[PDB]
């Protein structure tokens, strides 16, 4: 009923910390994201992840990073974790040079496309917008 | 025999589809603040859905915006967990 956690490593944790964006994207600087990334780094480090932080990544870079990780050998890892900190719209996240679909980033870790993470949890934590609506609340 | 390709994924979004996400330039975004605080005190003893549920609660209750614009005052946020997991997940033992 539980995932088997008995491995040498908990797993890889990729933190993508996009703060500064190409002017062509029209997106403003994400102040505060550095404090997020630092707090996230410590948290997931404490859990037991091997955490690496990449900053102001292009869409190509973000694609390559996840693609490369999916191709790594995770045989000795309990799980995989990735954290995205950026601007966003629904189904898509901003690189510094534009947007790219979240599906494309995560699909590299599908069962048929990453056998060493088969039957192992694949975690994606995403801090980004998913549209423009706002919650007015109630009561 | 077989296992589905889309299985064993989990997505912890900071907000629901169609909606914005809040970030305070001084202390950081709401979702991350809450996520970390819950992980620092319960990361190794609670199951992941329990963790993310407490995060949902905290972001929902503890936070509400202040802003120098009539479009961002009094605003709220609720995160969004998407689970394709097939087991309970604990980060220890």
């Amino acid at each position: 009923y539980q995932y088997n956690m008995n491995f040498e490593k908990l797993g890889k944790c990729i933190i993508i910390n996009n703060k500064n964006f190409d002017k062509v994207t029209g997106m403003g600087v994400r102040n505060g994201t550095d404090k997020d990334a630092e707090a996230l780094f410590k948290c997931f480090r404490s859990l037991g992840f091997d955490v690496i932080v990449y900053n102001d990544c292009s869409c190509a870079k973000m694609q390559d990073l996840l693609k490369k990780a999916s191709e790594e050998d995770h045989t000795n890892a309990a799980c995989f974790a990735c954290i995205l900190l950026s601007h966003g719209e629904e189904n898509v996240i901003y690189g510094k040079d534009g947007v790219t679909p979240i599906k494309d980033l995560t699909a590299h870790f599908r069962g048929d496309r990453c056998k060493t993470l088969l039957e192992k949890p694949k975690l994606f934590f995403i801090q980004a917008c998913r549209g423009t609506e706002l919650d007015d609340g109630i009561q | 025999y077989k296992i589905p390709v889309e299985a064993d994924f989990l997505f912890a979004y900071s907000t629901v589809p169609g909606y914005a996400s809040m970030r305070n330039p001084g202390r950081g975004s709401w979702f991350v603040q809450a996520l970390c605080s819950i992980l620092e005190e319960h990361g190794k003893d609670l199951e992941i859905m329990q963790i993310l549920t407490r995060v949902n609660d905290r972001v929902a209750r503890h936070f509400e915006s202040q802003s120098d614009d009539p479009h961002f005052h009094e605003k709220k946020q609720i995160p969004c967990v998407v689970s394709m997991l097939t087991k309970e997940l604990y980060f220890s033992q």
């Binding site: 102040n31 917008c129 | 809040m22």
Partner: peptide, 4 residues
């Protein structure tokens, strides 16, 4: 407060 800002927006992502």
């Amino acid at each position: 407060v800002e927006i992502x």
